[PDB]
Design a protein around this ligand. Sequence first.
Ligand SMILES: O=P(O)(O)OC[C@H]1O[C@@H](O)[C@H](O)[C@@H]1O
Ligand SMILES: O=P(O)(O)OC[C@H]1O[C@@H](O)[C@H](O)[C@@H]1O
Ligand SMILES: O=P(O)(O)OC[C@H]1O[C@@H](O)[C@H](O)[C@@H]1O
Ligand SMILES: O=P(O)(O)OC[C@H]1O[C@@H](O)[C@H](O)[C@@H]1O
Ligand SMILES: O=P(O)(O)OC[C@H]1O[C@@H](O)[C@H](O)[C@@H]1O
Ligand SMILES: O=P(O)(O)OC[C@H]1O[C@@H](O)[C@H](O)[C@@H]1O
Ligand SMILES: O=P(O)(O)OC[C@H]1O[C@@H](O)[C@H](O)[C@@H]1O
Ligand SMILES: O=P(O)(O)OC[C@H]1O[C@@H](O)[C@H](O)[C@@H]1O
Ligand SMILES: O=P(O)(O)OC[C@H]1O[C@@H](O)[C@H](O)[C@@H]1O
Ligand SMILES: O=P(O)(O)OC[C@H]1O[C@@H](O)[C@H](O)[C@@H]1O
Ligand SMILES: [Cl-]
Ligand SMILES: [Cl-]
Ligand SMILES: [Cl-]
Ligand SMILES: [Cl-]
Lengths: 131, 131, 131, 131, 131, 131, 131, 131, 131, 131
Amino acid sequence: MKKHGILNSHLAKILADLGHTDKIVIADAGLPVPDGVLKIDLSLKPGLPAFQDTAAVLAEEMAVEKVIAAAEIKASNQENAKFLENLFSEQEIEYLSHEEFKLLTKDAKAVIRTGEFTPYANCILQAGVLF
Amino acid sequence: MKKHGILNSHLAKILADLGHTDKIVIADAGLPVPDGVLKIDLSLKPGLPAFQDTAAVLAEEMAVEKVIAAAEIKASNQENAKFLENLFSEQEIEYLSHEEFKLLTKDAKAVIRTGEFTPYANCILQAGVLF
Amino acid sequence: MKKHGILNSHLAKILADLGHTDKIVIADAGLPVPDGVLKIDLSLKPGLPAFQDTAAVLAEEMAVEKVIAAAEIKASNQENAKFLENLFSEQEIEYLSHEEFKLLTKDAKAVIRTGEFTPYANCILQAGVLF
Amino acid sequence: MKKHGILNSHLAKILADLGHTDKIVIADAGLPVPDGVLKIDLSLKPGLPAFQDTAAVLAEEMAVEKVIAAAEIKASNQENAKFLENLFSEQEIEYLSHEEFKLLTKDAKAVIRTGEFTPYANCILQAGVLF
Amino acid sequence: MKKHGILNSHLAKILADLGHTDKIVIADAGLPVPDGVLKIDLSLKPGLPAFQDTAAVLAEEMAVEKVIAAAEIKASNQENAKFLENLFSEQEIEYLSHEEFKLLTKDAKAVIRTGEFTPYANCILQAGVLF
Amino acid sequence: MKKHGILNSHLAKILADLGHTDKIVIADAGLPVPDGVLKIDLSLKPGLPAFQDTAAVLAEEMAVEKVIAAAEIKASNQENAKFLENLFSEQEIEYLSHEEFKLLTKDAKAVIRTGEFTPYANCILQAGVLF
Amino acid sequence: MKKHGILNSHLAKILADLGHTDKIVIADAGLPVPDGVLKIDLSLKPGLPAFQDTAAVLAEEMAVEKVIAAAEIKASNQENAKFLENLFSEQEIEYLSHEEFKLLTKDAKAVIRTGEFTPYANCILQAGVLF
Amino acid sequence: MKKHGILNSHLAKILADLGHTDKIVIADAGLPVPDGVLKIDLSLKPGLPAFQDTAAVLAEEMAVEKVIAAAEIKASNQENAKFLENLFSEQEIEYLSHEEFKLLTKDAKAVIRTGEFTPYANCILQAGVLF
Amino acid sequence: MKKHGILNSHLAKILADLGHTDKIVIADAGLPVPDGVLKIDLSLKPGLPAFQDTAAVLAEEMAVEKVIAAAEIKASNQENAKFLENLFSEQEIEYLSHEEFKLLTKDAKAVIRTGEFTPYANCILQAGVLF
Amino acid sequence: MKKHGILNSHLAKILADLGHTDKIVIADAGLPVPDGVLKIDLSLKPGLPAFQDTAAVLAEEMAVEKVIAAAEIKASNQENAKFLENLFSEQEIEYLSHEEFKLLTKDAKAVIRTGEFTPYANCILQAGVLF
Ligand SMILES: O=P(O)(O)OC[C@H]1O[C@@H](O)[C@H](O)[C@@H]1O
Ligand SMILES: O=P(O)(O)OC[C@H]1O[C@@H](O)[C@H](O)[C@@H]1O
Ligand SMILES: O=P(O)(O)OC[C@H]1O[C@@H](O)[C@H](O)[C@@H]1O
Ligand SMILES: O=P(O)(O)OC[C@H]1O[C@@H](O)[C@H](O)[C@@H]1O
Ligand SMILES: O=P(O)(O)OC[C@H]1O[C@@H](O)[C@H](O)[C@@H]1O
Ligand SMILES: O=P(O)(O)OC[C@H]1O[C@@H](O)[C@H](O)[C@@H]1O
Ligand SMILES: O=P(O)(O)OC[C@H]1O[C@@H](O)[C@H](O)[C@@H]1O
Ligand SMILES: O=P(O)(O)OC[C@H]1O[C@@H](O)[C@H](O)[C@@H]1O
Ligand SMILES: O=P(O)(O)OC[C@H]1O[C@@H](O)[C@H](O)[C@@H]1O
Ligand SMILES: O=P(O)(O)OC[C@H]1O[C@@H](O)[C@H](O)[C@@H]1O
Ligand SMILES: [Cl-]
Ligand SMILES: [Cl-]
Ligand SMILES: [Cl-]
Ligand SMILES: [Cl-]
């Protein structure tokens, strides 16, 4: 068995190919996935896994230099919007309209679907560099 | 969005094709997957999701006529062994050696990998019929 | 076997992947299917299954936020036009020219072909969200 | 549009390739489909379409020299058993155990899944020759 | 064996998928086939089968609402030009320059190659509807 | 355009790869094609092309060192059985039971389906060598 | 074995599909092959096969309507430039800049690589018609 | 970028799927790779990377339960044979004849080719469990 | 461009993956290629390239430890048989019946077809090692 | 085994197809690979293999006419920048902004990933000609 790194095999393969600036998406159960974009669904039941738990695992296994979320999250989802701010303190956090957000997902290397059943609980993690 | 059934898209597709006697496997994080058998990895980190959480969702979404587990589970993993007895109290439960158990996994339509980090926490759910 | 949800295995796989705003098409036996769009043919013979029967099953298994249909249906197929208005009373129904309607089908995730032998008995169901 | 023959596009392609002695299967909603065998699912909901309706359409579009069914159908599903004897009065009908029947389905060119929710409502149609 | 419809298996599969306005091409032995368009070659030797024999079988098996040919056929291939007028007397026949004709073939679902060895012996059959 | 050789593009590709002893089959409209064997269907309508016309074209484009047919042809199809004898004078003609014949087709590089509607009008041509 | 036509199986397959105006490229060992264009490498070692040897064979097996080469060939490879002029006496020979010549190769059905080790020894053969 | 685990993307993907008892092969530059087994070539030039360098990295990123090598390694490559003994002090090391060793490679999930230019510098690492 | 090694790109790719004992076949224009074995056709016309020319280039680019040919070559094709003995004087040359030779080609990584038009002009080159 | 040329099998295959002006990229551990471009990862661990070692091997096995690197390399990575200037003194070296450099990698035939952990350690090698 693999000693270090993320446990999920599908995710490990995605992280392995990440280059500087590549993007991956963590989505709630409702976010549509653009055609041609790999979808890794971790959902089990409503609320499992949670957006927060998923983002937390990714944060410790991936080097993030920028996080992008939809502005609507600040109003419609205060708890998760705060979570992001807290978790990605040293990272640049950019906000866009949900509409522009969805356009950006087309360039993502993959979309990770969580069991999150709350509005605008989605974010794009942009890969940084280790040197 | 889909209104009924299991939330996970990968899993919904497998359940959709199940016919009477078809088998699927719920596995701990260390079980090897035979060549040619589809693997759906739901693991996020050690213990998440657990074997019990996963098995309970599946029992809720599919008609199970028989459950197969490795005898070594009773001795080495009492808690989970008892959970199974309770969960599938109405179904027939068969115990084989872990060796025979693995051979049987070759005929599975899929292996669902959980984040379970305890010995012999695996089982085969054999589809029953709705009429 | 799968306990809940739509019975058809092909349709279950399509519904499983539906995200907010994704579209599927229910069509009569003559609608042309754009290249690249998955075609699921349920027809057995003229009138079987009927447009009404198919639309009714989907309405109960999928969350629909909007229905799109061709204006011509109100002229050449009042029967089915009324059925649609009644079935989706709570949803927004938009009428476009049959020409524009066909253009939109290029963006569908699938086209479900029925055995309906009446003109303009086609509609686009746009997925809603469960939360 | 195609003027003659079976209306369903998937079935038309299968019939088009039929040679003398090739077999296709008409099955209830629970019959398991062997790996490697094409599955065409026409089901919409329980009982739709029915075994009888599907078998009748195929009987008129395909030349059948022999019909194979499971002996158990005469015991648990007399209704459909009589239908079959009547529909294929001119053809040779053979009864085998459900177990052997399933074995034979491995050699079929396709399995047509209906919405039939009654036991052993399955049959194998063996192609005849037009000259 | 299949009882009704066109005898050729490759062709049956194409007709099976035709929807209103879909196009197929019948071509002489020299017409170039655009990239991405399926080619079904029925030629055996020069003149076998002929454009006329092929066109007549197709007119018998598919509903044609419009026929498109190259204007150069009237001048250089009078016999075949007249055959078409007679065969599709009830349909609308449109003549374009051979140059425009070829561009149009890019949208065809298939090109049927015949053994015809005479100039501009090609046409596009546009599927009509059965209701 | 290709100056020499057989006109049919599908057949040209098959002849191009023939090595000493490789086999190809010419079949009537009813012969079943084993799985994994390429099928090139030239049929247009019953009796077109004819078994005789097809075999004749192949005879002049391919080096045949042996022909294999089913014994039943001699009795059930005297006209075509004589044709073969006449056409392949200098070639070794071996006869087998239709049953053994079908077993041999599994090793064929391809099956050429003609529009021949007569019993046992099938034969296997075994490639010779040009030096 | 195949009796007539070009000996090389790969090439026979390419010529088999040639339609009027289709293009193939004969190239020296350094010509780059556009992405998507089929490459058939016949080279064994420098100078074998020679550009002249390959062009001769093709001229004999293909109906050539036009020949295209880079003007630079007259300046740096007069020997091959003269050969080309004589070989295609009856056909149209067009000279373009090497830069435009390369853009044209993107439309070719294939690039045939020879062992030619001399500058600009490349040409495009445009297929003609046999009637 | 990925924070933890092996640096090589190809290898990370292979380790990600490892289950208990799965096997991978580290090989010298001459070891033949069985058909069907994935080959990951890391060699740059003779001796780079070295067998020792590669085995060390893997030992640090993979949970090794058993090591298998050919007895011939003790006779012709004592240096690497000793290295292996020390590196896997706590694990079981089994020696088989080079001939049997090769048969065992057919079951491997992958063969990692190094630049090692010394005889019998190959070994099979059998995955263990993390619990 | 590649500075060193064999010039042919197809062959370069095959040599690149050769491991100790892997085999490749050099064949005359008539040798049949077993299904599943890659065929690289270098023939241009009868006698070009010749068996000898091809074998010479391969011997210079590949480390061969053993050669295998049909016994019939010594009698029916004296010239090439002598060439073989001379070219591979250092290596072991084993002669088998042509029938047994053909069975061995099933294990070859590829069959290189030459334009050689003389009988039994075939041989298997078994890869050696560089250390 | 292959006697000459680059040792790595993956790279050998890429060099084999290089034509005049084709480009390949040597990259540090962080350079992102554009979708559609083949990635060959030779990294083992940070610093192995090094950028310099990889570039040296390639320069010896490929005819390079031009090198392209990011301008930022001269300032942020002086050591490797000097190495580059020294290794490719005969060739033309063009410096572009790193942003413009990345756009150019879209046209590369492949990206070779090294274990280099220093910034802007990337370059594009443009293939020259051997004659
Ligand atoms: O649900 P509303 O607010 O209507 O639209 C936003 C949602 O739709 C999808 O993009 C995501 O699931 C997001 O949460
Ligand atoms: O822990 P031991 O008994 O060594 O091996 C059994 C484990 O190995 C794998 O098959 C499963 O993960 C199972 O739990
Ligand atoms: O208005 P047109 O396209 O002529 O006829 C409409 C019918 O054609 C097809 O699109 C559908 O079957 C629809 O019912
Ligand atoms: O006899 P068993 O297999 O238990 O039950 C028969 C039913 O199981 C499936 O094969 C079919 O659905 C059939 O109707
Ligand atoms: O004969 P020309 O006018 O030169 O070219 C027209 C022919 O070329 C191909 O498009 C068709 O075969 C058509 O018949
Ligand atoms: O038609 P019968 O004589 O029953 O069986 C022989 C035929 O069945 C198929 O193999 C061929 O079409 C052959 O002509
Ligand atoms: O050799 P130079 O003149 O530099 O470039 C022309 C060559 O480059 C490639 O396009 C062809 O191989 C052609 O022969
Ligand atoms: O070098 P000899 O001893 O001849 O053969 C053993 C070698 O052949 C291949 O299996 C491996 O590369 C191993 O190192
Ligand atoms: O020519 P005969 O002796 O009949 O058969 C041997 C030939 O058949 C093929 O295997 C080879 O081409 C070989 O040269
Ligand atoms: O490190 P910065 O300057 O932020 O970005 C440049 C790096 O990002 C990637 O393109 C390469 O790895 C390069 O070294
Ligand atoms: Cl479902
Ligand atoms: Cl049909
Ligand atoms: Cl040919
Ligand atoms: Cl990892």
